[PDB]
């Protein structure tokens, strides 16, 4: 398993990970975490949870990664690690570790995995979580082109009706996710997030966002 220490990637063993999370009552995993700013804000405000942000593009994380390793007086944190990995190839070391898991504003292939949904991929995501872990997926089209691309490929259109459908619910269930709630949210809700991408979404044109949440049932 590869983690980020500043701008450098280093190996982290299962045994090392175990020792780190031993100091926390809860563990949260944010998949496709982006620039790290969402995780940073959560972590600084909740020192009783260990936050794992996973992203395949390490350069997206450099700035926040450099911040978390500073002294506490300069913004350093001890309850955050950034894992460099993709949804299609998650580290075995993260199996059965999370009390909660989020996928926030995914785009491209990750978004397709969530909305189709891709059973094989979501099953591997569910494997990261402990029995009955909380989950939330928050989705929207990134831009008109992405909307057109997903639609051209014959993928389902993002709507509350679709996420409420018996078919989506059954498919997520087969992947190990029990949907408890589906909400349509607005730009104002998104303003709560701290990532640059979320700010751009929140303050840009009016857009529909959807939150599907519940608990991991696979276990």
């Amino acid at each position: 398993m590869l983690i980020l220490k500043g701008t450098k990637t280093v190996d982290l063993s299962k045994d090392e990970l175990t020792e780190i999370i031993g100091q926390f009552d809860r563990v949260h995993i944010d998949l496709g975490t982006g620039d790290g700013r969402n995780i940073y804000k959560l972590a600084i405000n909740d020192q009783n949870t260990f936050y794992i942000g996973i992203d395949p593009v390490k350069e997206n994380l450099f700035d926040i990664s450099k911040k978390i390793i500073k002294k506490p007086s300069k913004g350093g944190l001890s309850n955050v690690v950034f894992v460099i990995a993709a949804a299609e190839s998650l580290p075995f070391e993260l199996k059965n570790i999370a009390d909660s898991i989020s996928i926030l504003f995914p785009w491209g292939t990750l978004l397709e995995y969530v909305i189709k949904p891709n059973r094989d991929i979501l099953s591997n995501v569910a494997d990261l979580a402990k029995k009955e872990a909380h989950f939330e997926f928050v989705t929207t089209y990134s831009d008109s082109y992405e909307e057109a691309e997903i639609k051209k490929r014959g993928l389902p259109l993002l709507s509350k009706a679709y996420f409420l459908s018996e078919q989506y619910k059954a498919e997520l269930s087969n992947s190990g996710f029990r949907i408890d709630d589906v909400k349509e949210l607005d730009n104002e809700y998104v303003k709560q997030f701290n990532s640059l991408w979320a700010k751009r979404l929140a303050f840009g044109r009016k857009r529909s966002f959807f939150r599907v949440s519940g608990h991991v049932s696979k276990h």
Side-chain angles (χ1 to χ4, degrees):
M1 176 162 52
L2 289 180
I3 66 164
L4 211 49
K5 278 272 144 184
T7 60
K8 297 181 178 182
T9 59
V10 292
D11 295 324
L12 183 67
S13 69
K14 179 62 177 166
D15 290 356
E16 289 172 297
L17 176 60
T18 288
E19 291 303 281
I20 295 165
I21 70 178
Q23 293 304 124
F24 300 88
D25 281 331
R26 291 187 138 250
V27 175
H28 179 80
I29 292 176
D30 184 38
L31 177 59
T33 201
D35 65 16
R37 292 175 190 188
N38 287 338
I39 276 284
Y40 186 88
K41 178 70 173 174
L42 292 177
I44 201 165
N45 291 118
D46 185 8
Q47 287 292 292
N48 296 320
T49 296
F50 186 72
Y51 289 88
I52 301 169
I54 304 180
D55 205 280
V57 189
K58 64 183 181 185
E59 291 77 8
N60 287 350
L61 286 163
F62 278 0
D63 294 327
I64 292 293
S65 182
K66 288 188 289 189
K67 183 155 59 171
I68 63 166
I69 65 174
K70 299 180 184 301
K71 300 185 307 297
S73 57
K74 289 179 170 48
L77 297 175
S78 56
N79 67 326
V80 173
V81 62
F82 293 120
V83 171
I84 303 312
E88 321 83 84
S89 39
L90 296 160
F92 178 77
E93 288 88 354
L94 299 178
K95 282 204 162 183
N96 188 47
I97 194 183
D99 299 274
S100 54
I101 172 158
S102 55
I103 305 177
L104 307 172
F105 312 102
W107 64 20
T109 58
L110 184 58
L111 176 64
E112 289 185 338
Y113 300 153
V114 168
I115 69 182
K116 186 186 174 185
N118 185 308
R119 206 181 336 269
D120 296 316
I121 301 299
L122 291 193
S123 189
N124 293 336
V125 172
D127 276 348
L128 303 176
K130 299 195 282 174
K131 186 178 185 171
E132 289 300 315
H134 186 262
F135 79 92
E136 62 170 333
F137 303 153
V138 178
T139 56
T140 189
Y141 295 117
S142 299
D143 57 23
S144 60
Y145 280 118
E146 169 164 87
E147 178 171 3
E149 294 281 354
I150 305 304
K151 177 176 188 175
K152 185 214 302 188
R153 280 159 58 87
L155 283 138
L157 295 174
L158 282 184
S159 74
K160 177 167 183 181
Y162 172 66
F163 292 138
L164 285 171
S165 69
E166 289 311 313
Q167 180 170 165
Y168 188 73
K169 176 190 304 172
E171 296 240 37
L172 269 219
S173 180
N174 288 344
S175 306
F177 297 91
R178 189 192 78 244
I179 296 178
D180 283 346
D181 188 59
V182 177
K183 294 186 205 301
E184 190 177 328
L185 301 172
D186 56 15
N187 289 239
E188 192 68 19
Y189 153 88
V190 181
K191 301 184 176 165
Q192 300 172 290
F193 292 93
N194 283 265
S195 72
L196 180 59
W197 180 244
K199 296 300 189 191
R200 290 191 173 160
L201 292 171
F203 286 95
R205 63 173 179 87
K206 172 173 180 174
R207 193 180 309 255
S208 315
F209 308 83
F210 307 97
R211 173 179 187 264
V212 173
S213 65
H215 292 84
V216 173
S217 58
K218 189 178 176 191
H219 316 294

